[PDB]
């Protein structure tokens, strides 16, 4: 593994969110700025196949401070605390190159009025639904068209702080200000059903959280679990959310990112004739500004929690192929962790993840 730390030339601005979409890692933040880097350019620089002086975003444009970015190969969903835009046609489908903003179609999808604020935006590509969490309801919109499908109303005392996508598309999970984990069954139509309410389970702080569950959808990770002062823990979605493993004790009140790699890896132990399949989690250790990468099978870190930033990590995103981790903080420095086969082994075909979901 190589760590490339690349200070951004963005003056006094801040990057709050990022997303790996298509060939790009897309950064977005204050002043409405969006900047797109080719993932492979950063990886190639990390392995010295190209030089550092050539690094530069392929496309930058300006949309309010941006806190949310998600989407697919046809639409970027870009959100402030009060507005959500859709930028469609952002990727030239014939060349796999990002278009300039001048070829992009942009639409104001949603606006809320203070005191309301958007606490999270999550996109479930299998349901075809975007979830907009507001401080107190969850709104369900059809993707692209953005027709309103339904609305989940929850208690006045329960602010929905963050949402967690189910890779199988059967559920949506919310963590609340009054310490609950709420699990809803969701249908593609937008109809919904509360199926699990776990109370006094998590301590949420007034932050934008970035949490993803395991690609097999069997583990829900929790920052600041107050079951099993507080710790980062893994809950078994198939065994009544029992704690299966604790990763960090104590967790930091400033930790807001815990994301699984989408890959399911197999690494042989050739000397002993055996092999191990495992998942990877990126989060922080007890100190803000650390990055910890955790092998869920060995239940060990890949390396000592590494102090990379003087400030809390704002967001992290794995590459789609599982071999690169991108991270950003208020230090305005893009962190690229570029793994190799000799580090991790081989990402398994999606058949193997799909078999474990069923």
């Amino acid at each position: 593994m190589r760590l490339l730390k690349y200070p951004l030339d963005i003056h006094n601005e801040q990057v709050n969110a990022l997303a790996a979409l298509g060939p790009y890692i897309i950064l977005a933040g204050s002043g409405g700025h969006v900047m797109a880097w080719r993932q492979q350019q950063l990886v190639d620089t990390a392995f010295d196949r190209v030089m550092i002086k050539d690094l530069k975003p392929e496309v930058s444009f300006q949309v309010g401070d941006i806190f949310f970015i998600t989407g697919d190969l046809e639409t970027l969903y870009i959100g402030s605390e009060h507005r959500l835009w859709g930028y469609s046609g952002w990727l030239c489908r014939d060349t796999n190159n990002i278009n300039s903003v001048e070829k992009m179609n942009s639409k104001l999808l949603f606006e809320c009025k203070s005191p309301s604020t958007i606490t999270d935006v999550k996109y479930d590509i299998n349901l075809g639904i975007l979830f907009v969490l507001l401080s107190n309801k969850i709104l369900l919109f059809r993707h692209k068209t953005f027709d309103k499908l339904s609305e989940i109303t929850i208690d006045k005392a329960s602010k929905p702080i963050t949402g967690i996508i189910d890779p199988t598309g059967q559920t949506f999970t919310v963590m609340t200000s009054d310490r609950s984990i709420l699990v809803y069954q969701i249908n593609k139509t937008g109809t919904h059903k509360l199926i699990n309410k776990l109370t006094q389970h998590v301590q949420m702080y007034p932050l934008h959280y970035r949490i993803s569950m395991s690609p097999q959808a069997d583990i829900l990770p929790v920052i600041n679990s107050v079951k099993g002062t507080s710790c980062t823990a893994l809950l078994d979605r198939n065994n009544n959310y029992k704690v299966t493993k604790t990763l960090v004790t104590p967790s930091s009140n400033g930790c807001r990112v815990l994301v699984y790699s989408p890959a399911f890896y197999e690494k042989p132990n050739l000397k002993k004739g055996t092999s191990t399949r495992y998942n990877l989690i990126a989060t922080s250790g007890s100190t803000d500004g650390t990055i910890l990468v955790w092998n869920t099978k060995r239940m060990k870190p890949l390396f000592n929690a590494l102090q990379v930033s003087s400030t809390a990590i704002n967001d992290m995103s794995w590459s789609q192929d599982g071999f690169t981790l991108f991270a950003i903080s208020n230090d305005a420095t893009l962190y690229t962790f570029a793994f190799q086969e000799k580090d991790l082994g081989v990402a398994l075909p999606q058949t193997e993840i799909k078999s474990l979901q069923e």
């Binding site: 190589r2 760590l3 490339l4 870190p301 890949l302 390396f303 580090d343």
Partner: peptide, 11 residues
């Protein structure tokens, strides 16, 4: 401001 590029050995 210059980039840092470091090798990080794994366990």
């Amino acid at each position: 401001e210059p980039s840092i590029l470091i090798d990080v050995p794994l366990y």
